[PDB]
Design a protein around this ligand. Structure first.
Ligand code: GCH
Ligand code: CA
Ligand code: CA
Length: 124
């Protein structure tokens, strides 16, 4: 679930700032998106979006209001390392892994302040 994704990000990036959640970044970090990602960090968010799109396409998976962000799973954090519980059901596991890979992706991507709250209607 979205709140768990935020938790994973803190796990992989302890120094991240909470207030950032009020902000969007690039063309894809935030809800929806358009055009092409502006940088590596933004690419991570687009890939995460694509990962969720794939999950929704699994006929075996149905999410509340068709939103994977509502799907709660089980995961654990240990020394900045994220582990998705093997007990998650197939749909939950897919979502957990999308979240995990995105969190890892975020942890390695450079952060460009100029891309925070970007004028998407113009650059996306
Ligand atoms: C982890 C990175 C980096 C933060 C940072 O300030 N780094 C400085 C540094 O490099 O040291 C941030 C930048 C924009 C954030 C996203 C936006 O706030 C939009 C949206 C907000 C949601 O609450 C959680 C998911 C996410 C996709 C957020 C995931 C994550 O929270 C992002 C992708
Ligand atoms: Ca997005
Ligand atoms: Ca669940």
């Amino acid at each position: 679930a979205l709140w768990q994704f935020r938790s994973m990000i803190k796990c992989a990036i302890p120094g991240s700032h909470p207030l950032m959640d009020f902000n969007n970044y690039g063309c894809y970090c935030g809800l929806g998106g358009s055009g092409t990602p502006v940088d590596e960090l933004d690419r991570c968010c687009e890939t995460h979006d694509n990962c969720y799109r794939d999950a929704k396409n699994l006929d075996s998976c149905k999410f509340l209001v068709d939103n994977p962000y509502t799907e709660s799973y089980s995961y654990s954090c240990s020394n900045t390392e994220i582990t998705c519980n093997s007990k998650n059901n197939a749909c939950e596991a897919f979502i957990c892994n999308c979240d995990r890979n995105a969190a890892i992706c975020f942890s390695k991507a450079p952060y460009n302040k100029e891309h925070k709250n970007l004028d998407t209607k113009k650059y996306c």
